[PDB]
């Protein structure tokens, strides 16, 4: 009911090899052509990816910037408030990014900031201007 | 199996069932109540046992009933019916046994037997055993036909059948007790050696062999599971099915490499797209670092937009620096996977050129066993007789297998050098016309009630006929003759004065350089007391080596032997014999095979006797007059000696039941 292990015999396969006399070598030749094809298409992209791999030497080590460690304050300097409003216009609602800019405010404070000072810094308008880009 | 149940098995009979044949002779019992069948079955099994326990003397009905016990021995007629049935069909009191009850003074009936081959001799003995006048006509100057034995000095070597295939159920087992036969077991260990003379390593020898066996099963799957048995209106041979299997295994190897490297390109390309993302990201990070540097250059104290610009650019640069780092995890994973695949490539080939040659030897062995190129064997039917295989070791005959026919011929009327040439059978009897083989002038005529024809199938196949049937054989018989296969297989006997081979190996192979010559001298046998090696020529090679002089052949033989053992080690042989069975006119081949487009039903066709038309029209339908036996006539055991022998015993019973009557059917 099942062919012996390691033997591949499907109904579909057998006509394909017995359609004519040379249908055997014809089918094998195409597979030989299919392999050589894929084989050099590998070394093509192996060399394409070899060049791309070189352009990335040095990585980005020179462009890295030291980690700034700030304990996380709670009062809003007038300075820190102004940083925020500009961050909203540049960054929309990406609170993590907005907190990153201010550096000393955790994300939750920023959302709260969006309400407490929502009237006075006229936020609502700012977000629409950020929506325009 | 032991006991009375062993007797039935050793007689090729189920112990607990009545056979089709016993049904015909005992139709009362088989339609009868089940208890009587058990009675009968025991009486048969027991009687076989008695005969089997000692087959050197005749088993008389009287002797039988004595060793039988109640309640089995209550019904004498049942016992007499059973004993007489078994005696008639050669299941007891066959072969070479001493006569309790000596022959009747006057014989009844006259029968001519063509052929002194084992089929012939076995029927002849049986008929004479039954009180008939038997004469055998033989074209050769010796008996045994295709059981030939070369004998010179103390050298001895069969050029014909040389193997007994296991004594479990084999009638030759009985003949062995009857005739002393040096029966020597065949050690199955066979080392192969290539064209170079160096042995195959156990790694290959077992890898290739196991592939061979796997390849065979593959064809059985094609045959029985996929009905691959016709192709362009023509029946499929084993050879074709083997190629198709091999091609499909070579195909699957390529299919496997294609999807392997297509796994690589799927990954190289995932990498390509990943590096392009990384260049472009690095070039943006190059640009923001400059921008953040410039913004940091404006010395403070600055206004808050300029302070926002420094902080905003710094946030952005560390967000792009984060991306580029995650992408370099993802290139690390993908770089590792590419090395892994590049390290687990699938199998390069299906079989190497050396590997294909060892495979050829295993095919040559198969071409030897069936005495024919695999391209001719029917795929569906070639192994139809595998089901009735005997049990036990295969054996060889140390003292020459001719001892058996010669022993059977004792007591028989045999005309040697008598070439039958026309067979005339009519409603009133038959006439056989033969000539003398030495001077073909001197013509003989034999008249008898019936003719048993054990002419080899190669002879029956011959066009134009070496034997004319008058009237001609009906189409249903001649068509069976064309459809069937008569193969070929030749031997070369090498007689030396030194043993220079491994004496502990009975048989060792030689691997051929090409598929075409795979059977040319591909195997050697160490079987005799004297230093004699015996070399096969099977397959397509068999029929071709018959057009090449002995010397050339014995040359190629020595050369192969020199490669295995070194030029110094093997000397020139004292005596050399080469067979040519296809050339032999009383054989025209070696033995039969199940040709593509034939079937096992043809073997039954061959055995049906011929009944001629009535002489005076309107006269009653007559008796059958022409009977056939021989290895080509016995469906379940073709192409063997024991099969010949059984067919002899068969017709003898059939002829007897026709000319002497069977009183055991009441
Ligand atoms: C030629 C040859 C025959 C055989 C063998 C070898 C050779 C060379 N050996 C080989 O290793 C193969 C083998 C075997 C072993 C295991 C299994 C199988 C098997 O399963 N397979 C399917 C592969 C095969 C074996 C062997 O070891 N043991 C073995 O078991 N079997 C082997 N075999 C077969 C037997 O050899 C053969 O089958 C019997 O001998 C049958 O004898 P036959 O009696 O029916 O046929 P004859 O030819 O013997 O009788 C004819 C008489 O008619 C005379 N004749 C002709 N024309 C005229 C005329 N015009 N007028 C007057 N007389 C005439 C002729 O002159 C002779 O007098």
């Amino acid at each position: 009911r099942k062919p012996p292990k390691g033997m591949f015999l499907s109904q579909e396969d057998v006509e394909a090899v017995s359609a004519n006399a040379t249908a055997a070598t014809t089918v094998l030749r195409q597979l030989d052509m299919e392999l050589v094809s894929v084989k050099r298409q590998i070394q093509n992209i192996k060399q394409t990816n070899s060049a791309l791999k070189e352009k990335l030497d040095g990585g980005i080590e020179p462009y890295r910037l030291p980690e700034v460690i700030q304990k996380c304050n709670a009062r809003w300097t007038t300075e820190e408030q102004l940083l925020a409003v500009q961050a909203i216009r540049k960054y929309g609602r990406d609170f993590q990014a907005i907190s990153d800019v201010i550096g000393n405010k955790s994300v939750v404070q920023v959302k709260n900031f969006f309400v407490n000072y929502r009237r006075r810094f006229n936020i609502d308008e700012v977000l629409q201007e950020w929506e325009a880009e | 199996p032991s006991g009375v149940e062993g007797a039935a098995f050793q007689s090729r009979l189920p112990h607990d069932r009545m056979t089709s044949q016993e049904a015909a002779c005992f139709p009362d019992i088989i339609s009868g109540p089940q208890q009587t069948q058990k009675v009968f079955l025991f009486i048969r099994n027991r009687t076989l046992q008695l005969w089997l326990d000692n087959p050197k003397i005749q088993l008389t009905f009287e002797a039988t009933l004595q060793q039988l016990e109640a309640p089995y021995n209550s019904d004498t007629v049942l016992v007499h019916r059973v004993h007489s049935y078994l005696e008639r069909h050669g299941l007891i009191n066959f072969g070479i046994y001493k006569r309790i009850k000596p022959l009747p003074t006057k014989k009844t009936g006259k029968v001519i037997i063509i052929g002194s081959g084992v089929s012939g001799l076995a029927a002849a003995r049986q008929l004479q055993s039954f009180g008939m006048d038997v004469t055998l006509l033989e074209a050769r100057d010796r008996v045994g036909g295709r059981v030939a034995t070369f004998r010179k000095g103390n050298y001895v070597a069969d050029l014909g059948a040389m193997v007994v295939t296991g004594l479990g159920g084999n009638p030759m087992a009985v003949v062995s007790k009857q005739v002393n036969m040096e029966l020597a077991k065949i050690k199955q260990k066979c080392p192969l050696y290539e064209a170079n003379g160096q042995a195959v390593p156990k790694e290959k020898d077992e890898m290739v062999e196991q592939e061979f066996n796997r390849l065979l099963e593959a064809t059985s799957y094609l045959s029985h599971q996929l009905d691959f048995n016709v192709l362009n209106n023509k029946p499929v041979s084993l050879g074709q099915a083997l190629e198709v299997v091999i091609q499909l295994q070579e195909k699957h190897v390529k299919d496997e490499q294609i999807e392997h490297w297509k796994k690589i390109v799927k990954t190289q390309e995932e990498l390509k797209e990943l590096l392009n993302k990384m260049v472009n990201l690095k070039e943006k990070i190059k640009e923001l670092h400059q921008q953040y540097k410039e913004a940091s250059e404006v010395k403070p104290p600055r206004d808050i937009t300029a302070e926002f610009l420094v902080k905003s650019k710094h946030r952005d640069l560390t967000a792009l620096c984060k991306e580029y780092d995650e992408l370099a995890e993802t290139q690390g994973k993908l770089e590792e996977k590419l090395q892994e695949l590049e390290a687990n490539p699938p199998s390069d080939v299906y079989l190497s050129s050396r590997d294909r040659q060892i495979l050829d030897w295993h095919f040559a062995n198969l071409e030897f066993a069936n005495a024919t190129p695999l391209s001719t064997l029917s795929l569906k039917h070639w192994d139809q007789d595998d089901d009735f295989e005997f049990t036990g070791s295969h054996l060889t005959v140390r003292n020459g297998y001719s001892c058996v026919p010669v022993a059977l011929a004792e007591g028989l009327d045999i005309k040697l050098n008598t070439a039958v040439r026309q067979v005339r059978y009519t409603a009133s009897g038959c006439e056989v016309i033969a000539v003398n083989t030495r001077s073909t002038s001197q013509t003989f005529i034999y008249k008898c009630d019936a003719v048993l024809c054990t002419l080899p199938l190669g002879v029956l196949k011959q066009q134009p006929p070496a034997v004319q049937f008058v009237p001609p054989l009906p189409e249903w018989k001649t068509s069976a003759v064309q459809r069937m296969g008569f193969g070929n297989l030749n031997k070369v006997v090498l007689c030396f004065d030194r043993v220079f081979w491994d004496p502990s190996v009975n048989l060792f192979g030689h691997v051929g350089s090409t598929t075409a010559s795979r059977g040319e001298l591909f195997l050697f046998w160490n079987l005799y007391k004297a230093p004699i090696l015996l070399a096969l020529v099977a397959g397509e090679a068999a029929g071709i080596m018959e057009n090449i002089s002995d010397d050339v052949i014995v040359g190629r033989c020595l050369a192969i032997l020199k490669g295995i053992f070194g030029s110094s080690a093997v000397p020139q042989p004292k005596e050399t014999v080469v067979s040519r069975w296809r050339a032999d006119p009383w054989a025209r081949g070696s033995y039969s095979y199940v040709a593509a487009g034939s079937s096992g039903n043809d073997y039954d066709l061959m055995a049906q006797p011929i009944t001629p038309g009535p002489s005076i029209p309107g006269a009653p339908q007559p008796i059958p007059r022409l009977f056939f036996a021989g290895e080509h006539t016995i469906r379940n055991y073709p192409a063997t000696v024991h099969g010949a022998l059984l067919s002899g015993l068969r017709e003898a019973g059939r002829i007897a039941d026709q000319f002497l009557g069977a009183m055991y059917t009441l």
Side-chain angles (χ1 to χ4, degrees):
Chain A
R1 289 314 221 196
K2 269 214 205 254
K5 281 23 286 239
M7 299 268 136
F8 292 68
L9 316 170
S10 67
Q11 180 44 276
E12 89 174 331
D13 276 341
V14 298
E15 292 85 321
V17 187
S18 62
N20 79 5
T22 54
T25 52
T26 272
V27 172
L28 306 219
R29 275 264 195 48
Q30 294 310 297
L31 303 221
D32 272 20
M33 279 10 172
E34 183 86 19
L35 224 76
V36 56
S37 178
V38 161
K39 233 170 189 176
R40 64 189 149 193
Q41 181 41 213
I42 285 169
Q43 287 195 358
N44 202 56
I45 300 167
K46 210 155 105 178
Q47 269 164 10
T48 289
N49 281 25
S50 176
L52 304 206
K53 201 181 163 181
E54 187 175 23
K55 279 174 203 173
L56 299 194
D57 70 341
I60 59 193
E61 285 333 74
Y63 308 15
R64 266 263 170 42
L65 280 188
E67 64 198 5
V68 27
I69 321 150
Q70 275 183 183
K71 292 192 184 175
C72 185
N73 199 299
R75 294 174 168 255
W76 283 79
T77 71
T78 317
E79 163 187 22
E80 299 161 336
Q81 299 167 44
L82 286 152
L83 273 192
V85 192
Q86 278 191 284
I88 280 171
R89 169 95 176 44
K90 184 167 178 257
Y91 289 64
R93 308 167 226 243
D94 176 350
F95 311 161
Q96 182 34 264
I98 290 215
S99 156
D100 288 324
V101 172
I102 326 244
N104 86 23
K105 283 327 177 43
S106 74
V107 206
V108 39
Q109 244 155 156
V110 183
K111 264 255 62 140
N112 299 257
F113 172 110
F114 269 82
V115 266
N116 296 129
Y117 292 119
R118 156 199 163 84
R119 289 195 174 188
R120 310 184 255 179
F121 285 163
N122 217 316
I123 313 250
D124 275 356
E125 256 171 352
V126 155
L127 282 150
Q128 325 201 7
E129 219 120 351
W130 182 101
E131 252 147 37
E133 70 92 324
Chain B
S2 66
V4 304
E5 330 189 330
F9 168 86
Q10 185 41 41
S11 289
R12 312 153 295 271
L13 290 153
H15 59 70
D16 37 325
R17 218 221 317 170
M18 281 202 310
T19 75
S20 182
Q21 179 160 27
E22 297 166 336
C25 309
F26 302 81
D28 52 316
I29 293 168
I30 194 171
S31 59
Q34 197 100 200
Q35 181 52 13
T36 53
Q37 306 186 21
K38 274 192 227 224
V39 186
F40 159 78
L41 286 170
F42 178 86
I43 305 164
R44 149 159 71 74
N45 295 340
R46 186 76 183 109
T47 309
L48 297 159
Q49 187 173 64
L50 278 301
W51 160 240
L52 279 186
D53 284 319
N54 176 4
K56 292 227 230 21
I57 84 242
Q58 156 161 27
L59 177 57
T60 62
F61 165 51
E62 296 84 2
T64 304
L65 182 49
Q66 282 169 21
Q67 268 99 1
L68 230 215
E69 243 199 40
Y72 299 130
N73 69 359
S74 55
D75 189 335
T76 77
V77 335
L78 199 45
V79 173
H80 191 73
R81 283 172 85 190
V82 160
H83 174 283
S84 289
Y85 163 89
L86 307 175
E87 199 176 30
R88 191 40 82 78
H89 307 61
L91 294 177
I92 62 168
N93 301 310
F94 72 90
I96 301 164
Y97 50 107
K98 191 176 196 184
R99 289 263 150 68
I100 292 192
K101 299 171 66 179
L103 278 206
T105 54
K106 297 247 203 214
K107 291 105 126 190
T108 316
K110 176 70 192 303
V111 69
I112 286 296
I113 298 203
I114 293 166
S116 163
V118 195
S119 32
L121 301 151
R125 270 192 97 84
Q126 281 300 94
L127 290 171
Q128 205 189 59
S129 166
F130 296 176
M132 290 190 92
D133 191 337
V134 188
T135 289
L136 300 103
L137 297 203
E138 155 63 63
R140 319 202 173 236
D141 32 346
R142 67 200 184 56
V143 284
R146 273 169 297 186
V147 175
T149 290
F150 172 86
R151 288 156 179 288
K152 196 149 134 160
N154 57 138
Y155 290 3
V156 148
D158 302 283
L159 303 145
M162 83 213 118
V163 171
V164 188
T165 73
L167 274 39
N170 185 319
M172 305 297 315
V174 176
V175 180
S176 56
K177 305 178 204 124
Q178 302 194 349
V179 187
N180 104 132
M181 266 163 122
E182 220 129 352
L183 276 195
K185 303 183 264 193
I186 280 190
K187 301 174 186 179
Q188 304 292 346
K189 163 177 180 185
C190 183
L192 309 198
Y193 287 86
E194 231 123 343
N196 74 346
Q198 289 302 304
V200 166
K202 306 199 193 291
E203 277 269 342
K204 277 219 176 298
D205 205 13
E206 309 185 333
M207 177 273 279
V208 190
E209 180 161 346
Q210 196 51 223
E211 200 56 21
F212 169 73
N213 300 289
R214 291 175 38 87
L215 284 173
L216 277 177
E217 271 171 17
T219 66
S220 190
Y221 181 78
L222 261 64
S223 182
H224 299 132
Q225 293 299 320
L226 274 59
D227 200 9
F228 188 56
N229 300 131
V230 163
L231 179 54
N232 317 130
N233 307 324
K234 319 166 66 155
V236 177
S237 70
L238 184 68
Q240 298 176 18
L242 280 178
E243 269 177 345
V244 160
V245 164
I246 289 170
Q247 289 165 2
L248 263 63
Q249 297 324 106
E250 283 174 338
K251 183 224 185 188
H252 160 269
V253 159
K254 305 180 186 297
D255 280 358
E256 202 63 5
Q257 297 175 344
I258 293 173
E259 70 168 355
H260 166 259
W261 308 91
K262 290 177 70 180
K263 269 169 190 222
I264 287 189
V265 291
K266 185 181 208 222
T267 291
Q268 293 287 141
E269 280 209 36
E270 207 186 7
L271 192 57
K272 175 162 164 283
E273 164 153 328
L274 190 90
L275 307 195
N276 263 97
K277 199 169 295 301
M278 283 193 146
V279 165
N280 285 27
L281 196 76
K282 168 162 182 183
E283 302 305 346
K284 285 191 234 164
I285 296 168
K286 211 202 195 149
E287 173 189 309
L288 284 186
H289 179 81
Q290 183 56 34
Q291 298 186 358
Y292 165 95
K293 219 62 177 180
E294 283 176 4
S296 239
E297 293 323 68
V298 150
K299 310 277 76 136
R302 13 205 196 219
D303 77 8
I304 209 61
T305 63
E307 194 71 5
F308 170 70
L309 194 107
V310 160
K311 304 205 164 256
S312 88
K313 290 292 181 217
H314 175 294
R315 193 302 279 228
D316 291 347
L317 197 148
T318 48
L320 293 197
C321 278
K322 201 182 298 152
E323 298 200 14
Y324 183 103
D325 291 332
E326 314 200 1
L327 273 62
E329 284 277 311
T330 288
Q331 74 165 354
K333 309 187 330 168
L334 295 206
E335 280 221 296
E336 82 171 10
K337 149 144 22 143
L338 269 256
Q339 194 133 297
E340 153 129 342
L341 305 219
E342 219 269 3
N344 303 331
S347 309
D348 177 352
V349 294
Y350 173 48
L351 281 181
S352 88
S353 150
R354 259 185 119 217
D355 294 326
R356 167 52 129 110
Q357 297 172 168
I358 299 96
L359 192 56
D360 275 343
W361 183 102
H362 289 256
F363 287 140
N365 214 32
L366 197 62
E367 306 205 300
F368 149 63
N370 299 258
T372 185
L374 314 184
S375 57
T376 75
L377 284 175
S378 170
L379 170 63
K380 188 135 79 199
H381 302 283
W382 77 275
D383 58 334
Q384 59 108 36
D385 61 346
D386 173 23
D387 310 339
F388 305 77
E389 193 195 4
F390 294 157
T391 80
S393 301
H394 289 188
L395 291 67
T396 76
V397 161
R398 211 108 154 79
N399 31 338
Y401 201 20
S402 80
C403 62
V404 173
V406 172
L408 294 178
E410 191 198 26
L412 272 71
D413 184 37
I414 297 146
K415 308 310 170 209
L416 311 182
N417 307 292
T418 320
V420 159
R421 187 144 170 173
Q422 175 165 127
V423 180
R424 279 197 168 251
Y425 56 98
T426 66
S428 45
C430 313
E431 248 165 343
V432 178
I433 308 185
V435 305
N436 190 73
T437 50
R438 298 155 284 186
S439 62
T440 79
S441 305
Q442 170 175 47
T443 297
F444 290 73
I445 290 243
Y446 294 88
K447 304 237 164 95
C448 46
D449 306 289
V451 194
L452 180 58
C453 176
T454 90
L455 285 169
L457 164 66
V459 171
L460 302 179
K461 271 190 172 285
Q462 183 168 357
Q463 289 310 304
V467 177
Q468 184 184 2
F469 286 87
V470 174
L473 298 174
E475 153 181 331
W476 59 263
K477 173 83 63 169
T478 78
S479 295
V481 187
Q482 283 154 14
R483 280 192 308 265
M484 278 182 64
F486 202 53
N488 188 357
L489 155 67
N490 276 308
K491 299 193 183 223
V492 177
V493 182
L494 299 158
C495 292
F496 297 115
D497 47 345
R498 290 89 165 93
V499 193
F500 61 80
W501 43 89
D502 195 345
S504 50
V505 295
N506 283 135
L507 70 167
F508 62 84
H510 156 75
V511 185
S513 50
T514 49
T515 305
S517 54
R518 44 165 187 226
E520 170 162 345
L521 291 150
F522 79 133
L523 174 48
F524 294 70
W525 304 67
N526 169 24
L527 285 170
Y528 302 112
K529 251 124 221 194
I532 281 154
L533 282 180
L534 198 149
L536 270 58
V537 180
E540 298 279 11
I544 289 177
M545 294 296 127
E546 280 205 8
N547 292 340
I548 287 173
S549 77
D550 291 4
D551 299 311
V552 188
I553 286 175
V554 185
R556 312 187 178 184
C557 275
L558 302 169
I560 324 230
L561 287 212
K562 301 303 207 13
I564 292 43
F565 303 78
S567 311
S568 147
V570 118
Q572 285 267 329
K574 300 274 129 119
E575 289 293 354
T576 68
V577 185
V578 177
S579 84
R580 297 183 163 76
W581 288 102
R582 190 71 82 186
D584 184 352
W586 319 124
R588 285 234 193 317
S590 56
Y591 43 93
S592 61
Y593 70 73
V594 191
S598 180
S599 87
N601 166 54
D602 284 350
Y603 290 76
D604 279 343
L605 283 194
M606 292 302 297
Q608 276 321 94
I610 307 282
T611 303
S615 261
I616 319 110
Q621 232 281 12
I623 315 82
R625 298 267 179 203
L626 187 46
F627 298 86
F628 295 91
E631 61 82 10
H632 54 285
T633 57
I634 188 169
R635 183 189 177 127
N636 293 341
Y637 310 70
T640 68
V641 164
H642 56 267
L645 185 148
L646 299 188
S647 70
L649 308 186
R650 178 193 73 229
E651 292 305 81
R654 162 142 55 185
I655 286 147
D657 280 353
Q658 170 75 255
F659 291 84
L660 304 192
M663 334 281 194
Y664 51 77
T665 49
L666 269 61

